[PDB]
From a paper:
During bacterial transcription initiation, σ factors associate with the RNAP core enzyme, guide the transcription machinery to promoter regions of genes, and engage double-strand promoter DNA. Primary σ factor (group 1) is responsible for transcription of housekeeping genes, while alternative σ factors (group 2, group 3, and group 4) control transcription of genes during adaptation to certain intracellular and environmental signals. The group 3 σ factor, σ32, plays a pivotal role in the heat shock response (HSR) required by E. coli to sustain protein homeostasis and cope with heat and other stresses. σ32 synthesis is modulated by the secondary structure of the 5′ region of σ32 mRNA, which serves as a “thermometer”, responding to temperature changes. When the temperature for growing E. coli cells suddenly increases, σ32 is rapidly synthesized (induction phase) and then directs RNA polymerase to promote transcription of a set of HSR genes to respond to environmental temperature changes.
To determine the structure of E. coli σ32-RPo, we reconstituted the complex with the E. coli RNAP core enzyme, σ32, and a nucleic acid scaffold. The nucleic acid scaffold (−39 to +15; +1 as transcription start site) is composed of a 28-bp upstream double-stranded DNA (dsDNA) with consensus sequences of the −35 element, a 13-bp transcription bubble (complementary sequences on both strands), and a 13-bp downstream dsDNA. We obtained a cryo-EM map at 3.0 Å for the E. coli σ32-RPo complex with local resolution at the active-center cleft of RNAP around 2.49 Å. Similar to other σ factors, the RNAP clamp in the structure of σ32-RPo remains in a closed conformation. The omega subunit is absent from the solved structure, probably due to low binding affinity. The σ2 domain attaches to the clamp helices of the β′ subunit of RNAP via a polar surface. The σ4 domain of σ32 uses a distinct hydrophobic surface to bind the βFTH of RNAP. In the structure, σ4 adopts a helix-turn-helix fold, inserts into the major groove of dsDNA around the −35 element, and potentially makes base-specific polar interactions with nucleotides. K130 of σ32 makes a H-bond with N7 atoms of G−15 on the template DNA strand, which together with G−14 were identified to be the “extend −10” element. Specifically, H107 blocks the path upstream dsDNA and serves as a wedge to disrupt base stacking between positions A−11 and C−12.
Author numbering:
A (entry chain F): 15 to 930
B (entry chain F): 1136 to 1374
C (entry chain E): 72 to 183, 198 to 213
D (entry chain C): 1057 to 1342
E (entry chain C): 528 to 973
Amino acid sequence: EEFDAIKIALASPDMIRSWSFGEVKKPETINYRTFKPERDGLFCARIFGPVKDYECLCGKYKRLKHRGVICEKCGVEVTQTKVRRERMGHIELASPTAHIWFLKSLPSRIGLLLDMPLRDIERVLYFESYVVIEGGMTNLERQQILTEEQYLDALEEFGDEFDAKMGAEAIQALLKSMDLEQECEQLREELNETNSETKRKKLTKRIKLLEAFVQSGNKPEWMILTVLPVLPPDLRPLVPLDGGRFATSDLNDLYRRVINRNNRLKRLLDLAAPDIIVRNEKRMLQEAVDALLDNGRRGRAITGSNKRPLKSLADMIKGKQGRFRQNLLGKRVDYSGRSVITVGPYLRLHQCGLPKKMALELFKPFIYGKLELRGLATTIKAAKKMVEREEAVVWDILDEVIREHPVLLNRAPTLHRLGIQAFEPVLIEGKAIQLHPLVCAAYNADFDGDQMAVHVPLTLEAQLEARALMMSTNNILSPANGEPIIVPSQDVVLGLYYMTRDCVNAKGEGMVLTGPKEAERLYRSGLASLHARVKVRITEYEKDANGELVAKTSLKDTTVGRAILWMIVPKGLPYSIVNQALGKKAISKMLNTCYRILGLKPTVIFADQIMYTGFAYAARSGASVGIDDMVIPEKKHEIISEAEAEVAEIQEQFQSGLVTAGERYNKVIDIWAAANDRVSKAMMDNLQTETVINRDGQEEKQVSFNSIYMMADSGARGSAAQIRQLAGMRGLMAKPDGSIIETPITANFREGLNVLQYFISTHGARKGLADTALKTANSGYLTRRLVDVAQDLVVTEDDCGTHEGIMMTPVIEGGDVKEPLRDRVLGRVTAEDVLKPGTADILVPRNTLLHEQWCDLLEENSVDAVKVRSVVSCDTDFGVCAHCYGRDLARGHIINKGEAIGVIAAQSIGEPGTQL
Amino acid sequence: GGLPRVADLFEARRPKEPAILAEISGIVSFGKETKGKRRLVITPVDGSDPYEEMIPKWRQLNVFEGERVERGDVISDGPEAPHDILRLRGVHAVTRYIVNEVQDVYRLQGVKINDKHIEVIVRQMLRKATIVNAGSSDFLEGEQVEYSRVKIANRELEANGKVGATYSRDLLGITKASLATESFISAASFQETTRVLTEAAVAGKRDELRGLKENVIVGRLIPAGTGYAYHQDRMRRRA
Amino acid sequence: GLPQADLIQEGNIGLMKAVRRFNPEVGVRLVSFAVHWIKAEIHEYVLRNWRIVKVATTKAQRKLFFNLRKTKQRLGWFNQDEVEMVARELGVTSKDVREMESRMAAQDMTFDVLYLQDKSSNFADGIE
Amino acid sequence: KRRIQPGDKMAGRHGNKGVISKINPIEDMPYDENGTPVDIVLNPLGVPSRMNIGQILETHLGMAAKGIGDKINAMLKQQQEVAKLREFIQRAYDLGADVRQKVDLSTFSDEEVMRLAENLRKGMPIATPVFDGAKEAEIKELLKLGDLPTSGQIRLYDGRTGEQFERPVTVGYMYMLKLNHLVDDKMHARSTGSYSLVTQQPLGGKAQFGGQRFGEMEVWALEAYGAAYTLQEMLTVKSDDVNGRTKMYKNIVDGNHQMEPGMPESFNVLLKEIRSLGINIELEDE
Amino acid sequence: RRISALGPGGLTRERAGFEVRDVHPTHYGRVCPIETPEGPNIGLINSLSVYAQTNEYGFLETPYRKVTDGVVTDEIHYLSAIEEGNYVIAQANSNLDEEGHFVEDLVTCRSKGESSLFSRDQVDYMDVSTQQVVSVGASLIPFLEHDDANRALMGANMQRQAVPTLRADKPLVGTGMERAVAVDSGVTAVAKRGGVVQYVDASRIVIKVNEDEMYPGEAGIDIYNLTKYTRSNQNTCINQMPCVSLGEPVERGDVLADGPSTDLGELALGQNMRVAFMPWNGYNFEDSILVSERVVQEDRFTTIHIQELACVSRDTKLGPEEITADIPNVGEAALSKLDESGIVYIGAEVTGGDILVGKVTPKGETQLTPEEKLLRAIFGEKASDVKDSSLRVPNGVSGTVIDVQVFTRDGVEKDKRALEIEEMQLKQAKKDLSEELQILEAGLFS
Ligand SMILES: [Mg+2]
Ligand SMILES: [Zn+2]
Ligand SMILES: [Zn+2]
C-alpha cells in the first residue's frame, strides 16, 4: 500500500490465466424469474463471488462464523460482496486473434516488426489471401503473399514442402519464428552501408523497436491473443427496473457476442465441418474481438437498439468523459452547497453571509459531537431528532461551531487562483449568500442571478492552510502583475468624487476652520455645503527614515468635503492625496501608496473605511438620471446639412465621369467621418461646462454637474464613446462581410432610430454576441494546453552558480516608448554589476534584488541596459532557483522554495484570453 | 491577430513563407540552375563547404553575388520561423522574439502580464536536445534525449577528464512538448491515450511519482507548497 | 434485429444435422427434409439472444413468443376478455398471457435517475 | 404559495434584470412632500453604459398616466356630476399631435361613462407602438395635463433622518416582472448521502441530494495556492475513499479532526479496465 | 411560432459557422433579427415575423402595398425573397397625403439588397406597417427604438419567463398588441355566439343564445366550464375567472373569462411599481434591487405552485401489495390524517415526512442478533410479516392537499373513495344534462 512507481508492459497468457479466478463458458447473465446469476455465466457467483455479505447462493451458510467455507452444494465462497469489484475471469479462445491496438494504431507495431505493409497484414488477418511461412523449392520465399489462384498453382506443382496459412495463426507463427539479435545485426550493418537518408530513418525506427523489444523482455508473439480476460461484474452493472426493464452496460453484450462466436467455432471444429464455414466463423470471431477491444477503429461500428454505437473498453478511459478527466482529475465532493449570491454592504472584508439552514446542513457531524459532549444527547439518533426539531440550544451550539471555522467560496468558471477564497461565516436569515462588494472584481461576479459554491475544510491542517493562504485579507495584489486587485468602483467612486468636488459660490465659502471635525459639524448642521472652499488647519505625519512619525501643522486651502474625508486617511500619508477631485485612478493610487508606505492591515482598514464613506455619501448625494441629462448639441442639424450637401456635390461630380465610383465612396466615408468628429466635439463642448454667478455678481465658468458627465468623468461607469451614441451620433455601421455602409446613422438613442437604421445596427450586435459566445472554448483549450505543459515546474533551489542572463532595454515602436525600463526590471535580480565606471552609474552589486528604491535610483540617472537573471538560463536540474525567478508578485518579497510557478504562469497567461 | 495569433506563437507553427537565413559566414555566390532551383553556393572565409540552398524562383532574393555575410543574416525577407532563430542566433534571441510577439498582442488590448511567465513557458518549450556526436558518453547519435540528462552525463564525465557529448537544442510546441514527457501517466491523461498507452506498453516503461498531476491522480500530497517538506523527507529516507 | 451473419451460421449447423440423418431410400429431396432442422436452430438462437435476459424458458412461454406477434393487432394492453381468447386456443393460463405481454414491450435502457445509486452505500445511517 | 424574498430575480421589459437584496421597512424608504414612499429603488449607474433609455421614457409616461388616474380618482371620491367627468375624460382622450385614434364620448350613456371612469381610477392605459411611439413633447403635455412637473424629477427625503436629498430624483412607474428563478428551488446543501455504483462518488443535482463538482480548474487553483492538505482532503476523504470517509465521520463525531487517507476507488477501476484491455499494469513496491 | 435549423436533416450546433448565424438582408419582414437565444444556439433558432406567411412551396413571403402613378392603391401582394429584389420598396415611415401621394420628392427605399434615396416615380411597393420587422415578443416592448439591440434581445428573452401572480395587473404603458396575444393564445374563454348571460359562477357560465343565431331544433344555450387550479407543465397554477356579470349582453368573439396573466382580455405579465433611480447605501450595487415591505404585505408578487406525487401498488414474488390504513410500527398520531381507505383527506395541511398513502409489502425471512431478539421478546412486541412502504411527503416540501385521483384495474373492484369521485363526476354531468332537459320540457309545456 506504499508503492513507489507504476509499471506497464505486455501480458502473457500465463499472466492472464494467473489473474483469473475461473473460466466463463456460457453466454448467460441472470434468470428472468429470480434475479439469480446463471452458472458459469458472465455473472456467476462461483467465479466472481457471493452476491450478499457472508452468504452462499443456495443459502446453507448465512453467518460470519463460516468465514472461509466453500459451500458443498453451490460452491460459492462465504465472504464480503465487495470482492465482485476485484475478481477477474478469462475466456479460452478456440483460435488466436490479433490485438487491434497493436495493429491499427499508427504506426503499426506488428507491421514495423515484420517489415510488412499494413494492407497485406489486414488482408491475411481477415481471410483474403495467403502468406508463406517457410520456404519450399525456392520459387516462394518467406512472407510472400499468395493469392488464392497463386496458392492453387503453387500447391499442385511444389507439393506439401511449402507452408501457407490464413488468419492470425500464420502471423503468430511468423512473429514466433523471428530472432531479434540477428535482425538487429543485419539492420546495423546495412544502415552503416546505406547512403539514402530515408532508409536510414526507417531503419533507425525499426532498430529502436527491435531494441525496445529486446530490452523490455516482452515477447513479439504476445500481441496475438489466445486468452481473453474478463472485467469484474460490478464494473459492468445489470440492475432490474420496475416495469420489467433492465439497465445494462454494452460490455455485457460484447462479451456475450464473443462467447457465442467462440462456442460456435468450437462446435463447428468438433463437428468435422468444411473449411469455408470454419474460416467464416474465425473471421467473425476476430471481428467480435476487435469490436470488444475497440469498436470504432476499422470499419462500421457495431450499434445497439438506438442505432448508436456500443461503448467499448477503450472508450471508458479516453475523452472528456473518460476515467481520467471525469473521475480522477475532478470529482464531486461531500460537505458542499450552492445558493444565489447577494450583496452585503455592512460586512468586513474577511466575512461572508451564510444562511442558517445551509450551515445547519453543512455542519451536522460537528453539532452531533458537541451535543454528545454536553450530555444533552446520549445516542446519535437523539441528536438527530433534536437537530431535526431545531431546538433553541442547537442554534447556540451551531454559533459555537462556526466560530473561527472558515469556509471556501468558489464561482465557476475558475480562471485564476483568486476564484477560491476563504471567509469567516456570519449566520443570516434567508436563503441567499451575502458577498462583500470588494471581491466581486476578483470573482468577476455581478448580482443578476449568479450562483456560488461553498466548501467546508475538515482537518486542522486544512483550516490552517485556509487561514494562512486563502483568506481574502491575504490576497490583495494580483499574482499576474503585482497591481492591487481590490479597487473601489461604481457607487463608491461616484460618492468620493462628488464628495471631493468644489463650487465657486457654495454656501459657507470663506470660513477658516480649526480642523476636519469642525468641518463635519458644520456640514451635518446644514450651515455649509460640501463644495465650499475654506481654510482648515491640517496636521500630517511623515516617516523620516528613522521609523518614527513627525507631525507638521499648517493652514491649507481645501474644501469641506476633502477635510471630512481626511479623517479616515491613516497617519503617514501627505495631505496632497485627498486635496483634489478623486477619480477611480486617484483612489487606486491612494490605496497603492498606503500599501507601499504603511503595510497590509492599515490598507485593509483603509479600504473598508473608503467603501463605507463612498456608499454613505453616494446615498446622500441623491444622483439620478433623466431624459434632460442627455443634451443634444444645437449645431447638429447644420453639420448634417453640410455633410449631405458635400455628399451630393461628390455624387454630382461622379455623374459627369470626372471621378470614379470607388474614389467617390472613399470620399463619402471621409466626409461622414469628419462630420461625426465635428458632432462629437460640439456635443462634448456643450456638455463639459456650465455658467455660475460668483460672490461679485459676475458670470463665471466651472466644470458641469451633469449626472451623465459626472458618471463618465469620475470613471465609475461609462465613457465618451457611449455618450456619443446617447446624445450625438451612432456612426458608421459595417456590413456582415466587413464593408462600411455608405450612409451612417445620423440619429441617437434619445431621438430614436427608424426601422432601417435599427435593422442595419442589428448586424454588429449579433456578430459580437456570436464572437463572445464562441471564443470561450478556444480560450479554455489554450489554458488547458498551457497548464498541462507547464504543470510540473517548481522552485527547488535557493541559488544556482550561473553568471549569464539576458539584456533588458526599453521597447520603442514608431518613436513611442511603449514600455520603460523600471516596469521591466522591477523585482528582478541583477546578473552583473551596474556601477560601471565611465557612465557615472549607480553602484549596484551583483545578485541584487531590484527594489523600488533601486528602480528610482536607476531612473534618476541615465541607464538604458541592465542584465537580469532568467529562468531560461537557470542552471538547476529538474526545477529552477529562487534568484533566477525573482520577486513573488503576489507577496512582494523573494519567492520561497516549493512554489508551483508553472501553474501560476499558465493561469496568468490564460485568464485574459477572453478579452481578445 | 488575437487569440489565434497567440495560439500559433505558442505552438511554434512555421510560417508559410520562411525567410532564408545565413547558415554560416562566408561569401555568397550563385551556382547551378535547374527547373526552379537557384543555387546559393557560399565560400567560407576559412571553411570549404559550398552549402547550396533551395529557392523557388518566384521569390525575390535580397542578396547580390560575391559579398560576405555573417551568421544569422536575413535573405529574402519575410516572416521568420522560431526554429531558425533558435538554431542560428541562439536561445536568448528566440526567447526575446517570443516574449515581444506575445506582449505586442497583449499590449494592444491594454492587458498587463509580467514577462517571467512567458519565459517559464519558453523554458518548458526548450526541454529537448538531439545528440550530434557522442564521445565517451553512451549516447546514440541522432536520437532525441532530455537536455538535463545530457547535462548530468557531461558533468559526471568531467570526472577522469573525459569528453562529453555534442548536441543541438530543439524547439517543440506546447502540445508536442507535453506529449513527450518522461511520465506516461500524465501524457495519457492529457491527450491521445491509445497511442501513449500502446507505446508505453511496448517499451515497458515505468513511471515514478514526480509531477503534480500524477500525485493528484493517485491521491497523494503534491510535491509543492506544504507537501514539499514531506516529499523532501521521503526522498531523504530513500537516499 | 440480430446480425445476419450469426443467423446464417446457426442454420449451417442445422443443415449438417439433417445431412447426417438422411435416408436416401425415402425418395424425397433433402431440401424438404432439412427445412425443419434449419428453422429449429434459428428459432433457438433468437430466444436466447433477443434481449440481454432470456424471455421464454418454459413450454408455455415459447408458444406465446411466436404467436403474440401475429395475434397482437392494436398497440396497448389486452383487455380482460381478449386474454381468455388467446389463452383458450394456445392451451395456456391467463397468467402466462399477461406475463409474456409485459416481456414483449419492455425496452432496456443503457447504463450511463435513481438506478445509478448504490443502495448499500449510506455509511452514516449504518453508524447511527 | 411562494412570497418574494432576497435572492429572487426581477426584471423589466428593457433587458434590466436584478436580484432582490433587501426588504426595507416602510419608514426607511424615501418619501416625497406628501409622505407617500417609493416601492423600489434602482441604481441609476446601469443606464448609461448599457444604453437603454426606453425604461426612463416608460417611467416618465407611467408617472403621467398615474397622475391622470389619480385625478380621475379624486373626481370620483368627491361625487362630482357626470358632465365634468365626461369633459375631463374627453380632454384626456383628445390629447396628442395628429393621432389616428378618435374617441367620442357623446355616444356613451351615463352608466357606460361611470363604468369607464371606475375602470380608469387606477391609471389611464396608454399604447405606444414600436417605431411609431409617443414623442417627448407629447409626454410633457400629458404631464402638464396631470398637474405634474414636466422634468419628471421631484424632491425626496431620507426616511431614516428626514433630511432632503441634495439633487432631484427621477420617480415614476415601471412594469416589473418576476422570473422563474426562485431561490427556493436553487438553495441546496449536502453533508453525506449515497454514492454511485461504479465510481463510488457522490451524484449530482439537487433532486438527487448530490454534491458540488470540484473540477480540474479548482484543482489548478489549489495547486497555485499550494494548499496540499486541502487538495488531498478534497480528493480522498470527501469523494471516493470508502474507508477514509467512514473513519473521518467517526473521528469528527468524536471531536478528533484527524485524517487517514487511502487510495481512490476510481484508480482501481482504471487499473482493472486497463488490465481487461490485455495490458499488464501494476504498482511496484519500492 | 418557433423556427429551428436543427433536427433530422438539419445542421449541427458544433459544426456551424458564422455565416449561417448572421442576419441576412432577406430576413427583412420574414425572420425577427433580435429574438434569438443568447447561448450556443444563437444563430440557429429564430422567430417568425408578425405578418410573415409561407408560400405554396414553403418559402417565406411578406405583404406590401402597391403604388401606381405615385398613388398607393391600398391593395396587398405577398412577395417572396426572389420577387422583392427586383422592385423599389418604400419605407413605412414615408408620410403621405389623404389621397395617397408622397409628400417629398425623394423617398428612402430598398432595392437589390441595399437602401438608397429614390424619386417618387421609381417606387413600386411600400411596407404595410412599422411592426413588420419584429416578432410578437419584440413588439410588446414600449420605446423599443430607444433601446440597444443587445438589451432588446435580453428583454425579449426574459419576457417569456414571467410567472403569473395571484392577481393580474394591466400594464400602464403598452404597445397595443396585448389584446391579440391574449385572445389568440386560447387561455381565455371566448363566446362562440352572442346572447345574454343567464347564469354566472366562479366555475361556470351559461349563455342564452339569441334567436337569430340559433338552429331550428336546439335549446340555444351555451355552457362554459372553467378550469380551476390545475397544474401546468412548469408546476405553475392555471386558473380561470369570469369577467362578466349576470344579465350582461355579449357578442361573438367577446371574452367571458380571464386566463392566467390576463386582465379583462389583455395580456398582463407583471405589476406596476413606483420606482426611484438613486443609490441607497450600497444596496443597489451591481444591479441589486431594494424592495419595500409594503410590496410584500400586499402580496403583489405572490405565486402559486402545484406539485404532483404518485403511489403505485404492484405484485411481488413474495406477495401482492395492499393500500390500507393499517401500517405497523407507527402510532395513531401519524394515522390521524388518513381516511378509512388509507388516503389522506382533501384539504389537509402536510409537511415533510407526513404519510399521504398507506401501503404495506411482504417482507419474508430476516436475520436478527440474539440480543435484539431477546430485547424484542422482553418488550413483548410481536413479529410481523409486512413492511411499511407508504408514500411520504419529501423533505423540504409543504402544502395543502387539493386533489386525489385513484385508478384501478378493470378486474379489480373499486374502493370507496374512487366511488365518491365518480359520484361527483356523475353529479356534474347530471346537472349539465338537467339544464337542457328543463329548458326543453318548459318549451314543450308552453
Ligand atoms: Mg451575472
Ligand atoms: Zn451454498
Ligand atoms: Zn538559477
